[PDB]
Amino acid sequence: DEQYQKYKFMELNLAQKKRRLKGQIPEIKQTLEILKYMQKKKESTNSMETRFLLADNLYCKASVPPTDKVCLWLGANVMLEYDIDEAQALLEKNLSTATKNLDSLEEDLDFLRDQF
Amino acid sequence: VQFEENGRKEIDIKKYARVEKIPGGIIEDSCVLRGVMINKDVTHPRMRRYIKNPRIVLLDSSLEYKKGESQTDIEITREEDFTRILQMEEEYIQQLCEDIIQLKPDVVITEKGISDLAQHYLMRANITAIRRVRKTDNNRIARACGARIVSRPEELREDDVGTGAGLLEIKKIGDEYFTFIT
Amino acid sequence: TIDDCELVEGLVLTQKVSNSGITRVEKAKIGLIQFCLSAPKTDMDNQIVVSDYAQMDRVLREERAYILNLVKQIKKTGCNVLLIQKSILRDALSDLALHFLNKMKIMV
Amino acid sequence: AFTELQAKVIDTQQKVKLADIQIEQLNRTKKHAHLTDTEIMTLVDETNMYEGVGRMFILQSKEAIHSQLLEKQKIAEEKIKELEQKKSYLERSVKEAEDNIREMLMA
Amino acid sequence: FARNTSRITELKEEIEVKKKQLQNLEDACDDIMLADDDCLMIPYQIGDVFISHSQEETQEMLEEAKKNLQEEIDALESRVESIQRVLA
Amino acid sequence: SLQKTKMKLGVQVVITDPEKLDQIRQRESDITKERIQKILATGANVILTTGGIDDMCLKYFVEAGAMAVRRVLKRDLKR
Amino acid sequence: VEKYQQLQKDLSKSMSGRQKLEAQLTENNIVKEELALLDGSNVVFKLLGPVLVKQELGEARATVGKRLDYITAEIKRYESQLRDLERQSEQQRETLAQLQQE
Amino acid sequence: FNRLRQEQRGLASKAAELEMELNEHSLVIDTLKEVDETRKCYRMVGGVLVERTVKEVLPALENNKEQIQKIIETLTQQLQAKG
Amino acid sequence: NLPQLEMLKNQLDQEVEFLSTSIAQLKVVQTKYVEAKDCLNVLNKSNEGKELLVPLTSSMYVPGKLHDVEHVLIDVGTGYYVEKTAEDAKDFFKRKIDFLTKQMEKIQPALQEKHAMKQAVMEMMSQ
């Protein structure tokens, strides 16, 4: 009866959630390890010529001093800047803890939805 | 109606005339108009009517303002091109309609679309254009006014397109005005 | 014409070879071929997604080395022209391998 | 036959559906421009400031903010008046064609 | 529940593509060791930054990426094999 | 057939010039003075021209003597 | 119909890749065609991932040429599958029709 | 069907989009409420990036809801206009 | 006659809707290039070297001065390099934008012209 159609609809509307969530996960990873690996040591050590994004297609050479200043945005209106040690502390939860719930609400949710 | 001929005075089939379908009035006084008559499209007169300006002209030219001449091209891409295109269309249409003055008509007959930049020039020149006529109407008015049907202008001159004064009235039999080439 | 018919020793056959000094060759060593001279073929011409834009390049850059080893083996065999079997029961032949085997003056 | 003339009148209707879209796109973008102008006039009260295209932020002084809040908004302004002087032409093209097709072609 | 395919197919394909990426990273390491092996200038990227300074310093992240890929991917290959064996 | 109007080949109206739109025909008529000089040098004093040429265009060659005759059709042309 | 559907799927998965490679190729053609003549303003290197190495034009030309040959071969493969599908469309589709008829 | 369907859909969406905008402007308040948007900060409003102490953020972030709330309530009541 | 044509008109409608999704793709592809043109003016304004706040992936911002306009870079193909020189960074990426916009015309003109027959099929379907 309707079981097949509703099962397929639930699978589709939860696979879209899967795609979206593992869509934002990679760049927040990048935000963590890019900084924590390169900048936290080398920029805190000495100023170097660098590459920064001018746009998502225009890429421009740059140089950075030990600025050690970083800025986070969650929207088009609200901004906060941070140091180079607490910023990764606040960012690391937003993926390390977020994956456990969101992906369990994905893997375990799929396990249930195969019967739900 | 014998000027059309094959070596001698010979009228062709009823298609060379045209019936009328007025439901109003009375059948007791019904008659037939002297000359050609336009119907089932005209319901209100032109903005200049009851004037008498000689040498009726008739065209079948695609005189509409558009990207091309006889066809419509793709949407404009160079946004600056519109300023140039408006002026070029204005000059081109005015140059075409200049030779309409050679006849000085009261009514211009256009099977294709008459254009507002042409109609503005005509009203500045005290001329009017009737639009949306049928294919047989081209020959009908051409014979009635003493002309040959010409697709595009500047191939026209007096006594070869049109004869005498253009004396036309628009009036209603019933609730709708009809164009009467009287 | 009819009169220009002639008896010919050896073999004559329609054109295949181009841009390989096709004018003439003396003592042309002719080698029969009944084996593949192209990349391996399967359900697709590759074993990965045909949209893996970065990946077909990085795998066929060594597949080109493979076919280059094949044509170099043909060279050290001593061939001057090649004799390739009927095609339908075999994979096609890479024309770039033909281009390489042209430059040391070998036809197919 | 009247088939090609009917094709022309439906093409005129398609041009109407072009007209409404081409005016509404610019009036929404102009509303966004006015909102941005109000915001930029509000925020000039403070000095140490950055602007860019969103994907970057360039430092400047206050007079640069005054210059930029005008030099691009005035281009959008000249462009809106260009689009009225275009929209009037094309809306004439559609409306007068309707006036001379609908009560005419049904004959 | 025969959920193995839905839980092993994507893992197999992603492990394959990660192995291909690691092999290509090894190829890039070899290339920078012979092609444009010039000491004086070499643009090398850490996340979103070039520094055209590292020649021998490139390995400082070459080895990092090598192990962070290989250990995680063969651990997750053992994980997908575990998903396979728990059902069969 | 030189013409004021786009009924035959050679005449165009796409040009963006209020003058050239009209005087293309006049320039062609002045150039055809060379053609009528050529026909006179060959031996001809009258040139026949297919349909679509203007009578006022015929006047240009009537004035110069090498007059032009209108209304010859495709069968006349082939004959 | 089994064979017709299989050939349709083969057509689809070959043509998707062919179309995507065409979409990228329409850009790379021009980019490389002015790149081969604008030297000094741009110079050929390889951005093989997160690293840069000096690169020469000829191997890039060989790469794009063998892209072209590969994709043309795939086009003939796809079109051969198209004739296969249209050939099956008669008899592999009459398979069910003849059993329902008699 | 259509003459009513598209009209209702358009009139609903014209403010459903603004309802989604209010949803965004309400989920963005978490930074001010708990993430402590109170220091001297380089705040941006789109296209511009201001280094200011955040005093205006409360009136600005209330002025949007005080309008969009009545907009969406008007939409909700308009949905009941004709059935 | 009519019933089979009406039945196949559903498949005709679905292919037209696929091509309409294609032209919606056409409206959504201009973006990258249009903000590229909008970001043109940053290049010449900052050719002395100037402080920039730029995104790192999407969601991060870090201060940094841009320099070395003579090797401004664009990605292309399988991993090839486009090192934009200084004079190019001032003026010549305008023509580079012209060519990217030329591909954008391969998108809009050269595909809307062939979708003219799509709209013609819509008009013909009334019969």
CSV table of N, CA and C in Angstrom, one decimal, chain E residues 2-76:
chain,number,residue,atom,x,y,z
E,2,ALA,N,19.4,-7.1,5.8
E,2,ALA,CA,20.5,-7.1,4.8
E,2,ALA,C,20.8,-5.7,4.4
E,3,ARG,N,21.3,-4.9,5.3
E,3,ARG,CA,21.7,-3.5,5.1
E,3,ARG,C,23.1,-3.4,4.7
E,4,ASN,N,23.8,-4.5,4.4
E,4,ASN,CA,25.2,-4.4,4.1
E,4,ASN,C,25.5,-3.5,2.9
E,5,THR,N,24.8,-3.7,1.8
E,5,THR,CA,25.1,-3.0,0.5
E,5,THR,C,25.0,-1.5,0.8
E,6,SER,N,23.9,-1.0,1.4
E,6,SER,CA,23.7,0.4,1.6
E,6,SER,C,24.7,1.0,2.6
E,7,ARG,N,25.4,0.1,3.3
E,7,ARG,CA,26.4,0.6,4.3
E,7,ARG,C,27.9,0.3,3.9
E,8,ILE,N,28.1,-0.5,2.8
E,8,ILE,CA,29.4,-0.8,2.4
E,8,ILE,C,29.8,-0.3,1.0
E,9,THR,N,28.8,0.0,0.2
E,9,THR,CA,29.0,0.4,-1.2
E,9,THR,C,29.6,1.8,-1.2
E,10,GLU,N,29.0,2.7,-0.5
E,10,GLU,CA,29.5,4.1,-0.4
E,10,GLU,C,30.9,4.1,0.3
E,11,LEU,N,31.1,3.3,1.3
E,11,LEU,CA,32.4,3.3,2.0
E,11,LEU,C,33.5,2.7,1.0
E,12,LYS,N,33.2,1.7,0.2
E,12,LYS,CA,34.1,1.2,-0.7
E,12,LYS,C,34.5,2.2,-1.8
E,13,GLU,N,33.5,2.9,-2.3
E,13,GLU,CA,33.8,3.9,-3.4
E,13,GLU,C,34.6,5.1,-2.8
E,14,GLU,N,34.3,5.5,-1.6
E,14,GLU,CA,35.0,6.6,-1.0
E,14,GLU,C,36.4,6.2,-0.6
E,15,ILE,N,36.6,5.0,-0.1
E,15,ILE,CA,37.9,4.6,0.2
E,15,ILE,C,38.8,4.5,-1.1
E,16,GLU,N,38.1,4.0,-2.2
E,16,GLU,CA,38.8,4.0,-3.5
E,16,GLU,C,39.3,5.3,-3.9
E,17,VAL,N,38.4,6.3,-3.8
E,17,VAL,CA,38.7,7.7,-4.3
E,17,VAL,C,39.8,8.3,-3.4
E,18,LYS,N,39.7,8.0,-2.1
E,18,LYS,CA,40.7,8.5,-1.1
E,18,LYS,C,42.1,7.9,-1.4
E,19,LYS,N,42.1,6.6,-1.7
E,19,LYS,CA,43.4,5.9,-2.1
E,19,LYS,C,43.9,6.5,-3.4
E,20,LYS,N,43.1,6.8,-4.4
E,20,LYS,CA,43.5,7.5,-5.6
E,20,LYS,C,44.1,8.9,-5.3
E,21,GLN,N,43.4,9.6,-4.4
E,21,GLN,CA,44.0,10.9,-4.0
E,21,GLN,C,45.3,10.8,-3.3
E,22,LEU,N,45.5,9.8,-2.4
E,22,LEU,CA,46.7,9.6,-1.7
E,22,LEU,C,47.8,9.3,-2.7
E,23,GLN,N,47.5,8.4,-3.7
E,23,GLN,CA,48.5,8.0,-4.8
E,23,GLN,C,48.8,9.3,-5.6
E,24,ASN,N,47.9,10.1,-5.9
E,24,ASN,CA,48.2,11.4,-6.6
E,24,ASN,C,49.0,12.3,-5.8
E,25,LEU,N,48.8,12.4,-4.4
E,25,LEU,CA,49.6,13.2,-3.6
E,25,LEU,C,51.0,12.7,-3.5
E,26,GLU,N,51.2,11.3,-3.5
E,26,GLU,CA,52.5,10.8,-3.6
E,26,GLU,C,53.2,11.1,-5.0
E,27,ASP,N,52.4,11.1,-6.0
E,27,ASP,CA,52.9,11.6,-7.3
E,27,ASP,C,53.3,13.0,-7.3
E,28,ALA,N,52.5,13.9,-6.6
E,28,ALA,CA,52.9,15.3,-6.5
E,28,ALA,C,54.2,15.4,-5.7
E,29,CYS,N,54.4,14.6,-4.6
E,29,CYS,CA,55.6,14.7,-3.9
E,29,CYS,C,56.8,14.3,-4.8
E,30,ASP,N,56.6,13.2,-5.5
E,30,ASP,CA,57.7,12.8,-6.4
E,30,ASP,C,58.0,13.9,-7.4
E,31,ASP,N,57.0,14.5,-8.0
E,31,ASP,CA,57.1,15.5,-9.0
E,31,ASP,C,57.9,16.7,-8.4
E,32,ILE,N,57.5,17.2,-7.3
E,32,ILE,CA,58.2,18.3,-6.7
E,32,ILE,C,59.7,17.9,-6.3
E,33,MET,N,59.9,16.6,-6.1
E,33,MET,CA,61.3,16.1,-5.9
E,33,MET,C,62.1,16.0,-7.2
E,34,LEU,N,61.4,16.0,-8.4
E,34,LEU,CA,62.3,16.0,-9.5
E,34,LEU,C,61.9,17.2,-10.5
E,35,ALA,N,60.6,17.5,-10.7
E,35,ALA,CA,60.2,18.5,-11.6
E,35,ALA,C,60.0,19.8,-10.8
E,36,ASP,N,60.7,20.9,-11.3
E,36,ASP,CA,60.7,22.2,-10.6
E,36,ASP,C,61.3,22.0,-9.2
E,37,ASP,N,62.3,21.2,-9.0
E,37,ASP,CA,62.9,20.9,-7.8
E,37,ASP,C,63.8,22.0,-7.3
E,38,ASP,N,63.6,23.2,-8.0
E,38,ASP,CA,64.5,24.4,-7.6
E,38,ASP,C,64.3,24.8,-6.2
E,39,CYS,N,65.4,24.9,-5.5
E,39,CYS,CA,65.4,25.3,-4.1
E,39,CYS,C,64.8,26.7,-3.9
E,40,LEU,N,65.1,27.6,-4.8
E,40,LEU,CA,64.9,29.0,-4.4
E,40,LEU,C,63.4,29.4,-4.3
E,41,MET,N,62.5,28.9,-5.2
E,41,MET,CA,61.1,29.2,-5.1
E,41,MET,C,60.3,28.0,-5.5
E,42,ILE,N,59.3,27.7,-4.7
E,42,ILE,CA,58.4,26.6,-4.9
E,42,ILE,C,57.0,26.8,-4.2
E,43,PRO,N,56.0,27.3,-4.9
E,43,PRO,CA,54.7,27.5,-4.2
E,43,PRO,C,54.1,26.1,-3.7
E,44,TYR,N,53.9,26.1,-2.4
E,44,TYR,CA,53.4,24.9,-1.8
E,44,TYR,C,52.3,25.3,-0.9
E,45,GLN,N,51.2,24.5,-0.8
E,45,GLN,CA,49.9,25.0,-0.2
E,45,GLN,C,49.6,24.2,1.0
E,46,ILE,N,49.2,24.9,2.1
E,46,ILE,CA,48.7,24.3,3.3
E,46,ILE,C,47.3,24.8,3.5
E,47,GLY,N,46.3,24.0,3.2
E,47,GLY,CA,44.9,24.5,3.2
E,47,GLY,C,44.8,25.6,2.2
E,48,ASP,N,44.3,26.7,2.6
E,48,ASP,CA,44.2,27.9,1.8
E,48,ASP,C,45.3,28.9,2.0
E,49,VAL,N,46.5,28.5,1.6
E,49,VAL,CA,47.6,29.4,1.5
E,49,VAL,C,48.8,28.8,0.8
E,50,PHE,N,49.3,29.5,-0.2
E,50,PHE,CA,50.6,29.2,-0.8
E,50,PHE,C,51.7,29.8,0.1
E,51,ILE,N,52.8,29.1,0.2
E,51,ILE,CA,54.1,29.7,0.6
E,51,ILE,C,55.1,29.1,-0.4
E,52,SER,N,55.8,30.0,-1.1
E,52,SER,CA,56.7,29.6,-2.1
E,52,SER,C,58.1,29.6,-1.5
E,53,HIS,N,58.3,28.9,-0.4
E,53,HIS,CA,59.5,28.8,0.4
E,53,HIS,C,59.9,27.4,0.6
E,54,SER,N,59.0,26.5,0.7
E,54,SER,CA,59.3,25.1,1.2
E,54,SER,C,59.8,24.3,0.0
E,55,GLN,N,61.1,23.7,0.2
E,55,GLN,CA,61.6,22.7,-0.7
E,55,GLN,C,61.7,21.4,0.0
E,56,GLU,N,62.5,21.4,1.1
E,56,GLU,CA,62.6,20.3,2.0
E,56,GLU,C,61.5,20.4,3.1
E,57,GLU,N,61.0,21.6,3.4
E,57,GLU,CA,60.0,21.8,4.3
E,57,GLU,C,58.6,21.3,3.8
E,58,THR,N,58.5,20.9,2.5
E,58,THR,CA,57.3,20.4,2.0
E,58,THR,C,56.9,19.1,2.7
E,59,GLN,N,57.9,18.3,3.0
E,59,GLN,CA,57.6,17.0,3.7
E,59,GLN,C,56.9,17.2,5.0
E,60,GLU,N,57.1,18.3,5.7
E,60,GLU,CA,56.5,18.6,7.0
E,60,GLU,C,54.9,18.4,6.9
E,61,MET,N,54.3,18.7,5.7
E,61,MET,CA,52.9,18.4,5.6
E,61,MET,C,52.7,17.2,4.6
E,62,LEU,N,53.7,16.9,3.7
E,62,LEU,CA,53.6,15.7,2.9
E,62,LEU,C,53.4,14.5,3.7
E,63,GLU,N,54.2,14.3,4.7
E,63,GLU,CA,54.1,13.1,5.6
E,63,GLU,C,52.8,13.2,6.4
E,64,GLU,N,52.5,14.5,6.8
E,64,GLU,CA,51.2,14.7,7.6
E,64,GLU,C,50.0,14.2,6.8
E,65,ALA,N,49.9,14.7,5.6
E,65,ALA,CA,48.8,14.3,4.7
E,65,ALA,C,48.8,12.8,4.4
E,66,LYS,N,50.0,12.3,4.2
E,66,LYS,CA,50.2,10.9,3.9
E,66,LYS,C,49.6,10.0,5.0
E,67,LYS,N,50.0,10.2,6.2
E,67,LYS,CA,49.6,9.4,7.3
E,67,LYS,C,48.1,9.7,7.7
E,68,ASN,N,47.7,11.0,7.7
E,68,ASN,CA,46.4,11.3,8.1
E,68,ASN,C,45.4,10.7,7.0
E,69,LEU,N,45.8,10.5,5.8
E,69,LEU,CA,45.0,9.8,4.8
E,69,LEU,C,45.1,8.3,5.1
E,70,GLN,N,46.3,7.7,5.0
E,70,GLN,CA,46.4,6.3,5.0
E,70,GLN,C,45.9,5.6,6.2
E,71,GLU,N,46.2,6.1,7.4
E,71,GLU,CA,45.8,5.5,8.6
E,71,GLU,C,44.3,5.5,8.8
E,72,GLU,N,43.7,6.7,8.5
E,72,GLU,CA,42.3,6.9,8.6
E,72,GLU,C,41.5,6.0,7.6
E,73,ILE,N,42.1,5.9,6.4
E,73,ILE,CA,41.3,5.2,5.3
E,73,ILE,C,41.5,3.7,5.5
E,74,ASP,N,42.6,3.2,5.9
E,74,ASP,CA,42.6,1.7,6.1
E,74,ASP,C,42.0,1.3,7.5
E,75,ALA,N,41.9,2.2,8.5
E,75,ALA,CA,41.1,2.0,9.6
E,75,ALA,C,39.6,1.9,9.2
E,76,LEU,N,39.2,2.8,8.4
E,76,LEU,CA,37.8,2.8,7.9
E,76,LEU,C,37.5,1.7,6.9
